[PDB]
Design a protein around this ligand. Structure first.
Ligand SMILES: *[C@@H]1O[C@H](CO)[C@@H](O[C@@H]2O[C@H](CO)[C@@H](O)[C@H](O)[C@H]2NC(C)=O)[C@H](O)[C@H]1NC(C)=O
Ligand SMILES: *[C@@H]1O[C@H](CO)[C@@H](O[C@@H]2O[C@H](CO)[C@@H](O)[C@H](O)[C@H]2NC(C)=O)[C@H](O)[C@H]1NC(C)=O
Ligand SMILES: *[C@@H]1O[C@H](CO)[C@@H](O[C@@H]2O[C@H](CO)[C@@H](O)[C@H](O)[C@H]2NC(C)=O)[C@H](O)[C@H]1NC(C)=O
Ligand SMILES: *[C@@H]1O[C@H](CO)[C@@H](O[C@@H]2O[C@H](CO)[C@@H](O)[C@H](O)[C@H]2NC(C)=O)[C@H](O)[C@H]1NC(C)=O
Ligand SMILES: *[C@@H]1O[C@H](CO)[C@@H](O[C@@H]2O[C@H](CO)[C@@H](O)[C@H](O)[C@H]2NC(C)=O)[C@H](O)[C@H]1NC(C)=O
Ligand SMILES: *[C@@H]1O[C@H](CO)[C@@H](O[C@@H]2O[C@H](CO)[C@@H](O)[C@H](O)[C@H]2NC(C)=O)[C@H](O)[C@H]1NC(C)=O
Ligand SMILES: *[C@@H]1O[C@H](CO)[C@@H](O[C@@H]2O[C@H](CO)[C@@H](O)[C@H](O)[C@H]2NC(C)=O)[C@H](O)[C@H]1NC(C)=O
Ligand SMILES: *[C@@H]1O[C@H](CO)[C@@H](O)[C@H](O)[C@H]1NC(C)=O
Ligand SMILES: *[C@@H]1O[C@H](CO)[C@@H](O)[C@H](O)[C@H]1NC(C)=O
Ligand SMILES: *[C@@H]1O[C@H](CO)[C@@H](O)[C@H](O)[C@H]1NC(C)=O
Ligand SMILES: *[C@@H]1O[C@H](CO)[C@@H](O)[C@H](O)[C@H]1NC(C)=O
Ligand SMILES: *[C@@H]1O[C@H](CO)[C@@H](O)[C@H](O)[C@H]1NC(C)=O
Ligand SMILES: *[C@@H]1O[C@H](CO)[C@@H](O)[C@H](O)[C@H]1NC(C)=O
Ligand SMILES: *[C@@H]1O[C@H](CO)[C@@H](O)[C@H](O)[C@H]1NC(C)=O
Ligand SMILES: *[C@@H]1O[C@H](CO)[C@@H](O)[C@H](O)[C@H]1NC(C)=O
Ligand SMILES: *[C@@H]1O[C@H](CO)[C@@H](O)[C@H](O)[C@H]1NC(C)=O
Lengths: 418, 167, 204, 50
C-alpha cells in the first residue's frame, strides 16, 4: 500500500511559537517544454507520391489536402511564436562586465563560456548533451540555439547587474550584495541578515549551483519532460510512416505495383482504397498534432509567465518560482525548452519559544510593528518572524492600542523607553 | 518507380535480392545483370515559399526552396532552411521582417530590392556594473500600453441533416 | 494592432468557407449536386453515389467540428487569461511583472471590442537615471546603520539615504536607519556622521 | 429542387442559363418560356428551441 509520507505531529499550543535561527539557500531545477519540432507533410506526395492517376483520384476529395497544410503551417508559426514569447523578454542584449566581483557569489557555471564555439554556459551544455524522407519535411526553428543562448545570457546579465529594474524600464546597475539585500528584505528578512552572513550565503549558493551541476551530469532521468516531448513527436511520425505499409483492403500497399499490374479501370478501386486509408491516417496525425501543440502552447505560456514573474522580478506567489521563499531565478536554454534555476530561501533550524499576542506596560496593550513577541523563559523580546534576532522591547518596535482588558492571552512585562 | 540510383556499400547476402525500410518501400536493390548493390533515394522534393512584401508596395518576390541545396534548382543564397533565390544578401543585421529560418530573415529595403540577413536580437548594452555604483532614477514617465485579448468566437451551428442531405 | 482579434474572425470565416466549398466535391460520385443524381438514376443505382457523397460530407463535417473544438479551447484559454487580467490588473494592482503591462503597474481601463477585450495598462516607468556611489551600511559610533526603507547614496562628498525608485536625498538620521551589530562584519561599509535630531533639541 | 422562385435583378448574358453559387447550387435560373432570370432561395429553416 502506497505511503503518503512520514507522520509528523506539530506541537501546537496557544502560547508556543517556533522561530527559525538559520536558513538554506536552495537551488531548484525546473524544466519546461516551450516548443516542439516544426514539421510539414506534403499531402499529395504522401498519399499519392508521384502517380498521375493517384493524384487525379485524390483531387476528387476537394480540399482534404490544402487544409492539413494550413493547420501544420499554423502549428509551425505557433512554435516560433512560443519561443519568441518565452525568450525574447529583454529589449537589449546585456552582457556582464569583465570582472566577476558579485559580492562573493560565483556564476561561472551559468554565465556563457567564451571558450566553446557556441556561447552556451556549462549547465546549458550539460542539458544539450543530456537530450538526444517520404513527404514529411522538418523545418528548422527561426531562432537558432546560439540566439536562444544569447537571450538567456542577456537575461542572466540583466538579473545579475540590475536585479529586476531591467524588466521594468532602463536597466539600473546595483551592487549584487545590495540586490540580494533587496531580495531578502522582500521576503521579510531584514537586510541586516544578508550583509552579516554574506560569506555564508555566497558559499551556500555556490554549493547549490555545484550540486545542480552534478545532479544534471549524473542523473540521466532528469530532463524527463523535454525527452518525452521529443519521443512523442518522433513516435507520431514513425506511426504515420508505418501507416503507409497497410493494405487497407487493397491488394498491395505499393502504388507502383498496382499501377504496373492492372489497367486503370481496375486499379482505380484499389488506389481509392489506399487513398482513403492514407487520408484517414494523415487526418488522425494532424488532429493529434493540433492537440499536442495546444498542450505545448499552454506549457509555453506558463514558461513565459514564469520567466516574466520570476526572472525579471521577484515573485511572492507561493511555490510558483520554486519551493520555499523566492529570491531570484536564473534561466537556461535547453533543447526545445527552458530550465529555470530558482534560488529559494528555506528556514532550517527552529527553536521553540513562549509567545504572547501583546504586552501590558502601563495598562496599555502593546503590539509589535514587524515581528512577534518571544521569550526564552524569563525575558521577553520582539523578533522578526523568519529569523531569531531578539531585541529589547521599546516604544518604537511596539504601538499601543487601548487598554489590557480585551486582548486575549496578553502577558505582563516592562516596556523600555529609549 | 523513380529515384537516383547510386552505388552503395550495403552488404547484401548472396540470396538477398532487394532491401526495404520502415515504410516497406524498396530502398536498395541488386542489379539483375551485374550483381552489385544500388541504393535508391527519392530524386528531390521540397516546398516553395514566395517571400513577398505587400503587393500594395512592390511586385518583386524572392523564392525559397525549402531544404534543397543550391545545385538542384542573379542572386542565390544557401540558408540552412533551403535555397533562397532572388534575394540579396546583406552583411548587416536588422530586426526580423519576413522570417525565413535558422536566424535568417528577409525584408524589402533599399533602388529597392529584397534583402536577406541574419536577424539581430537587439542593441548591445554593457551595464557599467561595479561593487559600489548604483543608478537611481530622478524622473519618471507614465505610459499607457494596449493589450488585446480575444474572448469569444462566433457562436455557430450546423444542421447535420440539411447539410449532408439537403432536402 | 487588432490582428489578434482580426485573425480570430478570419479563422472562423475560413472554416465556414471551406465547409461550404466541401459541397462542391464529387467524393467519387458522378456529380456534387444531389438533385441531379436523384433525378438521373434509379434508387438501386443512386444508392452508391449518395453513399459516397454522404461519407465525404460527413467526414468533412467531423473535421470541421474537431477544428472548432480545438479553436474554441484556444479561445477559452484566452478568455480565462482575459478574466484573470481583468480581475487582477483592473479591479486591483498586480505585482506580477509584465502581466499588466511592461513597467510598474498602476491601474487599467477595460474597453470592449468585437469578440474581444482591450486593456489600457497604465504603467509607471523610471526615466532618467543618475550614477551614485553607494554603501550597504554606515558606521556612526562602531554600530552599523542600515536604511529602514531606502538605499544609501552619495554625490561624492556627502552621504544621503533615498528611496530606491526615485532620487529624493535626505539626511541620514537615526529615523531612516536601524542599527545592528558592530562595524566589522558588514562588507563594503563606510564611515559617516549619522545626525540625530534629538541632540539639538536636548541642548535647547 | 425546392426553392422560392423570385424575380431577380441579375444581369444574365444571352448565352447563360444557370447562375451558380459558391457551393455549386443553382442560385439563378433562366425561365425557358419567358427569358427572365429568377433566383432560388431555400424556403426557410432553423432550430426549434423549447
Ligand atoms: C547555519 O548553517 C550553516 C551551514 O549550512 C552553518 O555553517 C557551518 O558552521 C559550522 C560550525 O561553525 C562549520 O563547521 C561548517 O563548515 C559551516 N558550514 C558552512 C557551509 O559554512 C552556520 O553555523 C549555521 N548558523 C549558525 C548560527 O550556527
Ligand atoms: C567559480 O567556480 C568555478 C568552479 O566551477 C571555479 O573554477 C575553478 O577554479 C579553480 C581555481 O582557479 C580551478 O582549480 C578549477 O579547475 C576551476 N574549475 C572549473 C570547473 O572551472 C571559479 O574559479 C570560481 N570563480 C570564482 C570567482 O571563485
Ligand atoms: C534569557 O535571555 C536573557 C537575555 O538574553 C538572559 O539574561 C542574561 O543572561 C546572561 C547570561 O550570563 C547574563 O550575563 C545577563 O546579565 C542576563 N541579562 C538579563 C537582562 O537578564 C537569560 O539568562 C536567558 N535565560 C535562558 C534560560 O536562556
Ligand atoms: C499584570 O499586572 C497588573 C498590574 O500590575 C495586574 O493587575 C492587578 O491584578 C490584581 C489581581 O486581582 C488586582 O488585585 C490589582 O488591582 C490589579 N492592578 C492593576 C493596576 O490592574 C494583572 O493581574 C497582571 N496580570 C498578569 C497576568 O500578571
Ligand atoms: C521630468 O521629465 C519630464 C518629461 O516627461 C519633464 O517635463 C518637461 O519639462 C520641460 C521643462 O524644461 C518642458 O519643456 C516639457 O514640456 C516637459 N514635458 C512634458 C511632457 O510636459 C520634467 O521637467 C522632468 N523633471 C525634472 C525634475 O527634470
Ligand atoms: C553634494 O550634495 C551636497 C548637499 O547639498 C552639496 O553641498 C551643498 O552644495 C551647495 C552648492 O554649492 C551649497 O550651496 C551648500 O552649502 C552645500 N551644503 C553642504 C552641507 O555642503 C555638494 O555641493 C554636492 N556636491 C557636488 C559635487 O555637487
Ligand atoms: C572609520 O573610522 C574608524 C575610527 O574613526 C577607523 O578605525 C580606525 O582605523 C585606523 C586606521 O587603521 C586605526 O589606526 C584605528 O585603530 C581604528 N580605530 C577604531 C576605533 O577602529 C576606520 O578605519 C574608519 N573606516 C575606514 C574604512 O577607514
Ligand atoms: C518544541 O517542543 C516539542 C514538544 O515535544 C518538540 O516536539 C519539538 O521538537 C520542539 N521544537 C524543536 C525545534 O525541536
Ligand atoms: C492556553 O491553553 C491552555 C490549555 O489547557 C489553558 O490552560 C490556558 O488557560 C490557555 N491560555 C490562554 C491565554 O489561552
Ligand atoms: C550477360 O551477357 C553479356 C554479353 O553476353 C556479358 O558481357 C555479361 O557479363 C553477362 N552477364 C551475366 C550476369 O551473365
Ligand atoms: C498602400 O499603402 C499606403 C501606405 O503604406 C496606403 O496609404 C494605401 O492606402 C495602401 N493601399 C492599399 C490598396 O492597400
Ligand atoms: C551542396 O553541395 C555542395 C557540393 O558538393 C556541398 O559542398 C555542400 O555542402 C552542399 N550543401 C548542402 C546544404 O547540401
Ligand atoms: C560580408 O563580409 C565578408 C567579410 O568581410 C565578405 O567576404 C562578404 O563578401 C561580405 N558580403 C557581401 C554581400 O558583401
Ligand atoms: C555611470 O558612469 C559610467 C562611467 O563610464 C558611465 O558609462 C555611465 O553612463 C554612467 N551612468 C549613467 C546612467 O549614465
Ligand atoms: C570593489 O572592487 C574594487 C576593484 O579593485 C576593489 O578595489 C574594492 O575594494 C571593492 N570594494 C568592495 C566593497 O568590495
Ligand atoms: C412560347 O409559346 C407561347 C404560346 O405559343 C408564347 O406566348 C410565348 O411567347 C412563346 N415563347 C417565346 C420565348 O416566344
Amino acid at each position: 500500500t502506497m505511503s503518503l509520507g512520514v507522520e509528523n505531529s506539530v506541537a501546537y499550543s496557544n502560547n508556543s511559537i517556533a522561530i527559525p535561527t538559520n536558513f538554506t539557500i536552495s537551488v531548484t531545477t525546473e524544466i519546461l517544454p516551450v516548443s516542439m519540432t516544426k514539421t510539414s507533410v506534403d499531402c499529395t506526395m504522401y498519399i499519392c507520391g508521384d502517380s498521375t492517376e493517384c493524384s487525379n483520384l485524390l483531387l476528387q476529395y476537394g480540399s482534404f489536402c490544402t487544409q492539413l497544410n494550413r493547420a501544420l503551417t499554423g502549428i509551425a508559426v505557433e512554435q516560433d511564436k512560443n519561443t519568441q514569447e518565452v525568450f525574447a523578454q529583454v529589449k537589449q542584449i546585456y552582457k556582464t562586465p569583465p570582472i566577476k566581483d558579485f559580492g562573493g557569489f560565483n556564476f561561472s557555471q551559468i554565465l556563457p563560456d567564451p571558450s566553446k564555439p557556441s556561447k552556451r554556459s556549462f549547465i546549458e551544455d550539460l542539458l544539450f548533451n543530456k537530450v538526444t524522407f517520404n513527404g514529411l519535411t522538418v523545418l528548422p526553428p527561426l531562432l537558432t540555439d546560439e540566439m536562444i543562448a544569447q537571450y538567456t545570457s542577456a537575461l542572466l546579465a540583466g538579473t545579475i547587474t540590475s536585479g529586476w529594474t531591467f524588466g521594468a524600464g532602463a536597466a539600473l546597475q546595483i551592487p549584487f550584495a545590495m540586490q540580494m539585500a533587496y531580495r531578502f528584505n522582500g521576503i521579510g528578512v531584514t537586510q541586516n541578515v544578508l550583509y552579516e552572513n554574506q560569506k555564508l550565503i555566497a558559499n551556500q549558493f555556490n554549493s547549490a549551483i555545484g550540486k545542480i551541476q552534478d545532479s544534471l551530469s549524473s542523473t540521466a532521468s532528469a530532463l524527463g519532460k523535454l525527452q518525452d516531448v521529443v519521443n512523442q513527436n518522433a513516435q507520431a511520425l514513425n506511426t504515420l510512416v508505418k501507416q503507409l505499409s497497410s493494405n487497407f483492403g487493397a491488394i498491395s500497399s505499393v502504388l507502383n505495383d498496382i499501377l504496373s499490374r492492372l489497367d486503370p479501370p481496375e486499379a482505380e478501386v484499389q488506389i481509392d482504397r489506399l487513398i482513403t486509408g492514407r487520408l484517414q491516417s494523415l487526418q488522425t496525425y494532424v488532429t493529434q498534432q493540433l492537440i499536442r501543440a495546444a498542450e505545448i502552447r499552454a506549457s509555453a505560456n506558463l514558461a513565459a509567465t514564469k520567466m516574466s514573474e520570476c526572472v525579471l522580478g521577484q515573485s511572492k506567489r507561493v511555490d510558483f518560482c520554486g519551493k520555499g521563499y523566492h529570491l531570484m531565478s536564473f534561466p537556461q536554454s535547453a533543447p526545445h525548452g527552458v530550465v529555470f534555476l530558482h534560488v529559494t530561501y528555506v528556514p532550517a533550524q527552529e527553536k521553540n519559544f513562549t509567545t504572547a499576542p501583546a504586552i501590558c506596560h502601563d495598562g496599555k496593550a502593546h503590539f509589535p510593528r514587524e515581528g512577534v513577541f518571544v521569550s526564552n523563559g524569563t525575558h521577553w523580546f520582539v523578533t522578526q518572524r523568519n529569523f531569531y534576532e531578539p531585541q529589547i522591547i521599546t516604544t518604537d518596535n511596539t504601538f499601543v492600542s487601548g487598554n489590557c482588558d480585551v486582548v486575549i492571552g496578553i502577558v505582563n512585562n516592562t516596556v523600555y523607553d529609549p | 518507380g523513380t529515384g537516383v540510383l547510386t552505388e552503395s556499400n550495403k552488404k547484401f547476402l548472396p540470396f538477398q535480392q532487394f532491401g526495404r525500410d520502415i515504410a516497406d518501400t524498396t530502398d536498395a536493390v541488386r542489379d539483375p545483370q551485374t550483381l552489385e548493390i544500388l541504393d535508391i533515394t527519392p530524386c528531390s522534393f521540397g516546398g516553395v515559399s514566395v517571400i513577398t512584401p505587400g503587393t500594395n508596395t512592390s511586385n518583386q518576390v524572392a523564392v525559397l526552396y525549402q531544404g534543397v541545396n543550391c545545385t538542384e534548382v542573379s542572386n542565390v543564397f544557401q540558408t540552412r532552411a533551403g535555397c533562397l533565390i532572388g534575394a540579396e544578401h546583406v552583411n548587416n543585421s536588422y530586426e526580423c521582417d519576413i522570417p525565413i529560418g535558422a536566424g535568417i530573415c528577409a525584408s524589402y529595403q533599399t533602388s529597392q530590392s529584397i534583402i536577406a540577413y541574419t536577424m539581430s536580437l537587439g542593441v548591445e548594452n554593457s551595464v557599467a556594473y561595479s561593487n559600489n555604483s548604483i543608478a537611481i532614477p530622478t524622473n519618471f514617465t507614465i505610459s499607457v500600453t494596449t493589450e488585446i485579448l480575444p474572448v469569444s468566437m462566433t457562436k455557430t451551428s450546423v444542421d447535420c441533416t440539411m447539410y449532408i442531405c439537403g432536402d | 494592432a487588432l490582428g489578434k482579434l482580426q485573425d480570430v474572425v478570419n479563422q472562423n470565416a475560413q472554416a465556414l468557407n471551406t465547409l461550404v466549398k466541401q459541397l462542391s466535391s464529387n467524393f467519387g460520385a458522378i456529380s456534387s449536386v444531389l438533385n441531379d443524381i436523384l433525378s438521373r438514376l434509379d434508387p438501386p443505382e443512386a444508392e452508391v453515389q449518395i453513399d459516397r457523397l454522404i461519407t465525404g460530407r460527413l467526414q468533412s463535417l467531423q473535421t470541421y467540428v474537431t477544428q472548432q473544438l480545438i479553436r474554441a479551447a484556444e479561445i477559452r484559454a484566452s478568455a480565462n487569461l482575459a478574466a484573470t487580467k481583468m480581475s487582477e490588473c483592473v479591479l486591483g494592482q498586480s505585482k506580477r511583472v509584465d502581466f499588466c503591462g511592461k513597467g510598474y503597474h498602476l491601474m487599467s481601463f477595460p474597453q470592449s471590442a468585437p469578440h474581444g477585450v482591450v486593456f489600457l495598462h497604465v504603467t509607471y516607468v523610471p526615466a532618467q537615471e543618475k550614477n551614485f556611489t553607494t554603501a550597504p551600511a554606515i558606521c556612526h559610533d562602531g554600530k552599523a546603520h542600515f536604511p529602514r526603507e531606502g538605499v544609501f547614496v552619495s554625490n561624492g562628498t556627502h552621504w544621503f539615504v533615498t528611496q530606491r525608485n526615485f532620487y529624493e536625498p535626505q539626511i541620514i538620521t537615526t529615523d531612516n536607519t536601524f542599527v545592528s551589530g558592530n562595524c566589522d562584519v558588514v562588507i563594503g561599509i563606510v564611515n559617516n556622521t549619522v545626525y540625530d535630531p534629538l541632540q539639538p533639541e536636548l541642548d535647547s
